[PDB]
RNA sequence: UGCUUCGGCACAACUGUUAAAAUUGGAAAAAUACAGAGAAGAUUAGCAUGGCCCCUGCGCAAGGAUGACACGCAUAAAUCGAGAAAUGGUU
RNA sequence: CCGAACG
RNA sequence: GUAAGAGCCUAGCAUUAGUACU
């Protein structure tokens, strides 16, 4: 859970940011996945954003 | 699927097509359908 | 149109010649080209220039030069600690930081009661000695030929060696800023009045009390932090005994009133009686 | 990554020519060369810029300065060697071809300052590779047509659908248009 | 005064465009009901190439 | 309600004398006029007629000088101006030379009753009462001992060569430790000095000396009985693998792998490095001697296993395949003909090395588990390894694809695994929980 | 230096991005080793699209493997109600 | 007439 | 066989701000 979590979270957030700068605007679907993932991480500042 | 949207120191790169040219406008004179000349007539 | 500057970083002269170098630098935080200002605070001074954007300055109410807060002149940590406010959320990345900036363009520090903590931990007169030449790096190595003429201080560096590596971004944001770290460890010791090995000594000595403060006035002082067992005046020493009924109440009274509180104006010291 | 363009190369062929000229005079001045050898070598430098510099590779319009200096050389050499004077080095009448290259340089100073300021700006500001508009050139003509064509069909699709119809069958309509 | 020989001093930075101005109420007339008929006369068969 | 941000900025217009005059009445003199029109600021910090006249005198005197129109002028001085505390700085520069040259201990806590036995014998002298159990090795069945005393997880333990009566392990607590197996099961004495956790263990031939590499970049060789440090070699490189040559002649020399990809063959006799092998490309993980100290094959983070000769600074042979994986642990098979390489892909590959003929024996490969030191059975029927979940795996020799024995040993990573050379079915397991178990 | 009632006046007025440095940090490259190329069978020309990807270029050209990337691998549950039956409580 | 880059 | 990139070690561009005690 510690600092191995945090870097898996860095990896999956960079994955999400990459996907979102690519595909985010032109085809929906993606922000729901990104936001539900950030909700799974119980990060609600991030998911609200 | 989605076009690029085109929203808008300054860069000092000067294009060749952006050098001064046609630096004054032609206006319509008396005889080329100027606006004050055309109120005068019944079109 | 005018720098946002610590009024220490303008020196004693009511008149300032300052050089205005528009697009003269990159903000040391937002990495942005901005208008730099350069000037000599006074005759013993060097030429200081602004270090950050004007916006990045007035965000955290810090000087454009010293990056210290504008109201109290203490690093952004010490003020954020006394402000009790959250860690900086602002993005460290510059893509992030510029995105935050271009957002805030298109659409909390002025309304606080003066914090006694910051006021207690600040300099009375201005640190003009911060506006002065660096130390002659050729005088250090013993190889300075410029003699007394050197515009650089002919002294050696007398500095903490963990210090002298300070980071702009960290002094602006508030993360591992060794100077404010030193300062908070200072206040940690001064907030550390030794509660002695004797657990049962339930009395606090109140010394340096000027005579116009009466025993019921110091009672009005100390009643808040716990029950008083007995308060005892002696103006000969200008001092007082105060015993409580519970140790933790005298601990409260030491901890809150150890950093030299002033009862009705008198600069008074506390000790474990 | 080390392929330089016509601005760099025109600048350095022009600097090679000024080196040649300056060096001709420095040879005269060190004493290694006569005044007659200096004059003949300067007129040689100015008549042989297509042989001595390679500057026409980076601005091929300066073939007309080279043709003009060749015509000037034919005329001057003909009128020079009339009589016993004959057929070799020794003619140093260099002001005609010198002024040909001075006209070249006056007219190309603004072009080259532009080009070199652009090179310096890309070096110091970086390439502005960001949302500046690409022309529709002959190689993009057919692909841009289809861009525009599909965008037009997409316009129409979104306007043709009734109010509560899932607006995502447009991709299959675009596939039907490809098929048709 | 700036040196006339001073080349361009700062490199240009790339950011994604911000959110924009805030949204505006969509002041529409009542939804007009899609029949199931007009749901079927906009069923687009899949394209078999 | 204010104009600027920190005050009010207002345009002004004066005549230029006034800015400068006031700026220099204060600037130079210290005290000047307030620009607000309110008083003055701060605290304060010609020519004549006889002197004027005397200068006129010297002028007319230089005029009275005789001029000789015949004489040229010469230049006499001709460039006189051109040809032209210290104590604190002396002390500071002394401190600079000091911090410059300075820019350019370990002890023992004995834990037995008495360090020697009844016959003047040191406790490391092998007891006679123990003999070899069975010519065949057997699989572990139950718990026997649990060697605890490690404040954090250990790196690995090793059985004392020949007799296997005691074992020495290095820990992430910073210490090397020695524990008895056959009698008391006690920690005999602690030996510390590593500035952080120690990295591995490799004992001397007869058990008198002991070399320990540390995460402090120091390789310290100390005693077994007396517990004194013999020497400590460091160069500023992080060490991973220690081994002295298995020959009894050159046991004074050891091996040292460092994440600088170099293998320093080190003199414990002289103290300075005897040989330097720099033919590796990535971090130095594992090294094992083969052919009776003749050949040493080294494991690298560039995924290559490189066999070399002792004394040959040119690598003998390199083996690095697209399916090769990180090699943290090498194990020397009893026959001296095989090596067990631990592959980061959760496998133990068996490589053949017989008389310089090294090949992949990709048929005899063990897999199924998840830097575990591989342990070899004394007769060669068993292979043991650590795994992710605290599990010790035992594979049969004829069937490395038939998982023989699964042992739930520890709660966390179990890296150290060693078959007792004197016992038949007692094993040693050591994990990253500070727990070590004995199997029987 | 003029002018001088020889007392003195007049004139002239604030350089320095202050370093011969000190740190200080970030960088492309090199080797190594990794591994090493669009489309649908193979082999292959490309021109695009999108952008916090750039490089070469004077570039509103052209090129960089169609410059790269992306490009979906949809373990994108795109998911659920209808009814009979039958069984469970209560009378 | 007349030569360079790129693909 | 392209030639792309990830990284490792070692790897010379920009900066002038900041150093306290009742
Ligand atoms: Mg294309
Ligand atoms: Mg292209
Ligand atoms: Mg091709
Ligand atoms: Mg492309
Ligand atoms: Mg093409
Ligand atoms: Mg091509
Ligand atoms: Zn300031
Ligand atoms: Zn000096």
- Residues in chain A with CB shorter than 8 Å from the CB of B3 are none
Which ligand lies nearest to the CA atom of residue C8 in the structure?
Answer: 7
Categorise residue C74: left if φ over 0, alpha if ψ from -120 to 50, beta otherwise: beta
CA distance C117 to C251: 19
Q: What is the DSSP letter of C41?
A: -
The verdict on whether residue C239 carries a ligand-binding annotation is no
CA distance F219 to F236: 11
Angle, in degrees to the nearest 10, between helices D95-124 and D35-47: 60
CA distance A13 to A8: 8
| CA F219 – ligand 7 centroid, Å | 52
Residue of D nearest to B4 (CA): D131
The residue among F401, F311, F295 whose CA lies nearest residue F358 is F295
Please give the helix or strand (H or E) that residue F298 lies within, else none: strand F295-300
**Rounded alpha-carbon distances, angstroms, from residue F409 to C199, D76, E9, F182, F436:** 50, 104, 65, 20, 9
CA distance F328 to F340: 11
> Residue written as tokens 């930075």?
E13
CA distance F384 to F398: 14
The verdict on whether residue C66 carries a ligand-binding annotation is yes
CA distance C50 to C64: 5
CA distance C48 to C25: 13
- To test the contact with chain E by mutation, choose from C36, C53, C102 the residue with the greatest count of E C-beta atoms within 10 A, namely C102
CA distance F146 to F429: 9
- H chain positions with any atom within 7 Å of a protein CB: 2-6
Angle, alpha carbons F60-F63-F67 (nearest 5°)? 165
F23 interface with C at CB cutoff 8 Å: yes
CA distance F132 to F64: 124
CA distance D7 to B13: 14
| CA D140 – ligand 3 centroid, Å | 18
Find the largest Cα–Cα distance for chain C: 70
Which residues 6+ apart lie within 8 Å of F27 measured at CB? C13, C15, C42, C43
Report the distance from CA of residue F56 to the C1' of nucleotide G4 in Å, as an integer.
13
Provide the resolution (angstroms).
2.6
Long-range contacts of range D33-38, CB-CB < 8 Å, 24 or more positions apart? D36/D90, D36/D92, D38/D92
CA distance B2 to D28: 70
In the sheet with F263-267, reading across from the earlier edge strand, the strands are F239-244, F253-258, F263-267, F273-277
Cβ neighbours around F399 below 10 Å, total: 11
In the sheet with C18-26, reading across from the earlier edge strand, the strands are C18-26, C33-39, C48-49
Residue of B nearest to A27 (CA): B1
Categorise residue F287: left if φ over 0, alpha if ψ from -120 to 50, beta otherwise: beta
Angle, in degrees to the nearest 10, between helices C215-222 and C247-257: 100
Q: What tokens appear for F395 in the block?
A: 């594979």
Which residues 6+ apart lie within 8 Å of C100 measured at CB? C90, C91
CA distance C98 to C31: 9
The verdict on whether residue C28 carries a ligand-binding annotation is no
- Would you list the DSSP string of F71-130? PPP--SSSSTTT---HHHHHHHHHHHHHHHHHH---EEEE-SS-SB-TTS-BTTSPPTT-
Beta carbons of E9 and B9 less than 8 Å apart? yes
D131 interface with B at CB cutoff 8 Å: yes
């Amino acid at each position: 859970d510690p600092e191995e979590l945090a870097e898996y979270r860095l990896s999956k957030r960079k994955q999400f940011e990459d996907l979102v700068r690519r595909v985010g605007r032109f085809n929906g679907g993606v922000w729901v996945k990104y936001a539900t993932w950030e909700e799974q991480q119980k990060d609600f500042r991030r998911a609200r954003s | 699927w989605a076009p690029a949207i085109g929203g808008e120191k300054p860069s000092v790169q000067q294009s060749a097509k952006n050098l001064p040219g046609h630096t004054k406008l032609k206006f319509r004179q008396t005889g080329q359908a100027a606006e004050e000349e055309l109120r005068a007539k019944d079109l | 149109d005018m720098p946002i500057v610590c009024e220490t970083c303008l020196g004693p002269n009511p008149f300032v010649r300052m050089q205005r170098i528009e697009f003269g630098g990159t903000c040391h935080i937002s990495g942005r080209p901005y208008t730099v200002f350069r000037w000599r605070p006074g005759n013993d001074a060097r030429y200081k220039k602004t270090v950050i954007c004007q916006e990045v300055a007035k965000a955290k109410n810090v000087c454009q030069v010293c990056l210290l807060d504008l109201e109290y002149g203490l690093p952004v940590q010490v003020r954020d600690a006394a402000m009790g406010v959250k860690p900086d959320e602002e993005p460290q990345s510059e893509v992030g930081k510029e995105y935050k900036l271009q957002m805030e363009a298109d659409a909390s520090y002025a309304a606080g009661r003066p914090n006694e903590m910051l006021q207690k931990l600040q300099r009375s007169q201005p640190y003009y000695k911060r506006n002065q030449a660096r130390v002659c790096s050729f005088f250090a190595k013993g190889q300075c030929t410029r003699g007394a003429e050197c515009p650089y201080r002919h002294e050696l560096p007398t500095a903490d060696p963990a210090l002298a590596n300070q980071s702009y971004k960290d002094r602006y944001y508030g993360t591992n800023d060794p100077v404010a770290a030193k300062m908070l460890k200072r206040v940690d010791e001064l907030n550390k009045l030794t509660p002695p090995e004797d657990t049962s000594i339930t009395t606090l000595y109140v010394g340096g009390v000027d005579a116009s403060i009466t025993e019921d006035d110091v009672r009005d002082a100390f009643y808040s932090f716990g029950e008083l067992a007995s308060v005892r005046k002696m103006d000969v020493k200008s001092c007082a005994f105060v015993t409580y009924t519970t140790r933790s109440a005298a601990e409260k009274a030491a901890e809150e009133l150890g950093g030299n509180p002033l009862i009705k104006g008198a600069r008074v010291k506390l000790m474990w009686g | 990554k080390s392929r330089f363009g016509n601005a760099f190369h025109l600048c350095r062929e022009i600097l090679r020519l000024t080196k040649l000229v300056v060096d001709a005079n420095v040879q005269f001045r060190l004493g290694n060369v006569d005044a007659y050898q200096l004059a003949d070598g300067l007129q040689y430098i100015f008549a042989h810029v297509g042989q001595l510099t390679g500057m026409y590779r980076y601005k091929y319009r300066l073939m007309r300065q080279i043709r003009m200096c060749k015509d000037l050389k034919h005329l001057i050499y003909y009128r020079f060697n009339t009589g016993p004077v004959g057929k070799g080095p020794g003619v140093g009448f260099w002001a005609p071809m010198w002024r040909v290259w001075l006209f070249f340089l006056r007219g190309i100073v603004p072009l080259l300052e532009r080009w070199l300021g652009n090179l310096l700006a890309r070096q110091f500001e970086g390439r502005q590779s960001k949302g500046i508009a690409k022309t529709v050139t002959k190689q993009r003509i057919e692909s841009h047509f289809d861009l525009e064509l599909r965008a037009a069909v997409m316009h129409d699709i979104l306007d043709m659908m009734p109010e509560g119809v899932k607006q995502n069958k447009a991709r299959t309509i675009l596939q039907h248009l490809s098929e048709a | 005064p700036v040196d006339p020989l001073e080349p361009p001093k700062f490199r240009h930075v790339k950011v994604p465009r911000g959110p924009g101005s805030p949204p505006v109420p969509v002041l529409h007339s009542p939804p007009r009901p899609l029949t199931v008929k007009d749901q079927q006369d906009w069923k687009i068969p899949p394209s078999i190439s | 309600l204010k104009n600027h941000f920190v005050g009010h900025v207002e345009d002004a217009h004066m005549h230029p004398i006034h800015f400068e005059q006031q700026y220099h009445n204060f600037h130079a003199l210290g005290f000047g006029e307030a620009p607000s029109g309110i008083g003055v600021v701060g605290k304060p910090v010609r020519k004549t007629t006889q002197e004027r006249k005397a200068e006129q005198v010297a002028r007319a005197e230089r005029l009275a000088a005789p001029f000789d129109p015949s004489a040229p002028f010469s230049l006499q001085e001709r460039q006189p101006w051109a040809s032209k505390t210290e104590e604190q700085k002396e002390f500071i520069a002394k401190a600079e030379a000091a911090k410059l040259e300075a820019a350019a201990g370990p002890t023992s806590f004995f834990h037995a009753k008495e360090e020697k036995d009844y016959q003047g014998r040191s406790w490391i002298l092998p007891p006679r009462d123990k003999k070899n159990e069975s010519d065949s090795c057997f699989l572990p069945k139950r718990w026997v001992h649990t060697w605890a005393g490690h404040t954090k997880g250990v790196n690995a333990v090793r059985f004392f060569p020949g007799t296997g009566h005691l074992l020495l392990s290095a820990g992430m607590d910073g210490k090397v430790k020695i524990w008895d197996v056959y009698g008391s099961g006690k920690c005999m004495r602690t030996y510390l000095g590593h500035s952080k956790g120690v990295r591995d263990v490799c004992f001397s031939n007869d058990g008198r000396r002991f070399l320990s590499t540390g995460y402090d970049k120091n390789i310290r060789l100390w005693d077994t009985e007396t517990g004194q440090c013999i020497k400590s070699f460091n160069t500023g490189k992080v060490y991973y693998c220690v081994k002295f040559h298995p020959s009894d002649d050159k046991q004074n020399v050891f091996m040292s792998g460092c994440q600088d990809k170099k293998i320093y063959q080190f003199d414990t006799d002289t103290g300075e490095s005897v040989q330097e092998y720099n033919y590796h490309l990535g971090p130095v993980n594992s090294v094992t001697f083969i052919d009776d100290g003749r050949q040493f094959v080294s494991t690298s983070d560039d995924k290559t296993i490189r066999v070399w000769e002792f004394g040959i600074p040119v690598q003998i042979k390199y083996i690095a395949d697209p399916s090769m994986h990180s090699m943290p642990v090498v194990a020397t098979h009893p026959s001296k003909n095989y090596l067990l390489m631990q592959s980061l892909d959760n496998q133990v590959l068996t490589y053949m090395v017989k008389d310089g003929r090294f090949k992949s024996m990709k048929n005899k490969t063990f897999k199924g588990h998840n830097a575990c030191q591989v342990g070899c059975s004394p007769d060669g029927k068993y292979v043991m390894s650590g795994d992710s979940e605290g599990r010790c795996f035992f594979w049969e020799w004829g069937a490395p694809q038939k998982i023989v024995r699964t042992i739930k040993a520890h709660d966390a990573v179990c890296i150290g695994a060693e078959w007792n050379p004197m016992e038949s079915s007692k094993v040693a397991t050591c994990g990253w929980d500070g727990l070590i178990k004995y199997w029987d």
